[PDB]
Every structure is written in C-alpha cells, then in structure tokens.
C-alpha cells in the first residue's frame, strides 16, 4: 500500500552511535532524509559527469572519491575521503 523507502531507519542508527541518549523528532528526521538524498544526488551526478568526461562507462571508487573531493569543502573532503578509503579497504579485505 504505497510502500515508500527512506533513510529514517539508518539515520537513527547513526545518531544512536554518536549520541546514545538523544532522540530525534520526526520533523528533523525528514530534514536529515532530504539532506542525505541531496548529497547522494550531488555526488552521484558529479561521478556520472566524471565518468562521461573520461569516456568511462563505469562508476568506480575513483569517480566517487574525485566527486567527493570536488564537492565537499576542504577538511570535510579529506575526512570523507579517508572514511571512504577505509571502508572500501575493509570491504575488499573481508570478501
């Protein structure tokens, strides 16, 4: 019956990990969902543009990392690049 997906299950998990004793209202959860969707759209669009510019037909981790470096400003870019590299290394190291 009009099953719509969201990030409200995962945003709550990330919030509980950071702040163990701080709930989030259903109106701020919508803002966090919109923020996640917007940042995902920005990064994916930049990655697609990067792939098209180099005539590549595949979005690898390189395209996403370059898109993150292009979009995220300064220190945020460095931190997110480190996070993504660590996550990818852990993923390929654990099958």
């Amino acid at each position: 019956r009009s099953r719509k997906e969201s990030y409200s299950v995962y945003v709550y998990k990330v919030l509980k990990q950071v702040h163990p004793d701080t709930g989030i209202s259903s109106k701020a959860m919508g803002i966090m969902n919109s923020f996640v969707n917007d940042i995902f759209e920005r990064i994916a669009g930049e990655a697609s543009r990067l792939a098209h510019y180099n005539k590549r037909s595949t979005i690898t981790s390189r395209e996403i990392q370059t898109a993150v470096r292009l979009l995220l400003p300064g220190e945020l870019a460095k931190h997110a690049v480190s996070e993504g590299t660590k996550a990818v290394t852990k993923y390929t190291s654990a099958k």
């Binding site: 997906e5 209202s25 994916a44 990655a47 993504g84």
Partner: protein, 109 residues
C-alpha cells in the same frame, strides 16, 4: 546459494545500506555500469556526513537542555560550522530560523 547472507553494510562496517545505494546508483540514470566498490564508498561518505551533522546538532541541542533534535538545532549546527555552512549555503531548512546575528552598528552606545 548456501550461505549466511552477510549484508554488504556489515563487511564494510557501515550503517547506511550498501545494497540500497547500489540499487539507486544503478536505476538513477548515471552510468551503464556501476563498480562494486562505488556504493561502499558513497555509503561511507554519506554516513560520515550524517554522523558529523548529527553530532553537531546533538551538541547544539544539549546546550538548550533538550533531548530531542528539532529543525532549529540542525540549522544551528549547520550555520555555525564553516565547512557545513559552505556545503549547504544555498539550502533552506524548514522551521530552522536564522542565526542570531546583530550588526555592531545597530547596537546602542
């Protein structure tokens, strides 16, 4: 298909769904193919950004002696950090209000 079905968000240690991000990247009209390591990287970046903004919002909500993050707290956590304000400069947050900044000339003498 005899296995325990280890989800891709558990191998990478993330909390955001790697499978859902991969599905969105595939059916998002971005490229013909999507490498297997791209959803993991994108989910990690998204989770880091969400964790940072939520940490700042919780910090700005404990100051007001509150347990529940509201849109005003997200706006306070975004307008204060320089990198976040630069990344979300054009973004309007509903019921976020504005930062309490008064020019030094309007104040009395």
């Amino acid at each position: 298909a005899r296995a325990k079905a280890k989800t891709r968000s558990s191998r990478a240690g993330l909390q955001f769904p790697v499978g859902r991000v991969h599905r969105l990247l595939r059916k998002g009209n971005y490229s013909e193919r999507v490498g297997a390591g791209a959803p993991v990287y994108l989910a990690a970046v998204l989770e880091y950004l969400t964790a940072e903004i939520l940490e700042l919002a919780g910090n700005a909500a404990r100051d007001n002696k509150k347990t529940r993050i509201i849109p005003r707290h997200l706006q306070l956590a975004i307008r204060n950090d320089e990198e976040l304000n630069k990344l979300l400069g054009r973004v309007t947050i509903a019921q976020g209000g504005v930062l309490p900044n008064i020019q030094a000339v309007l104040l009395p003498k």
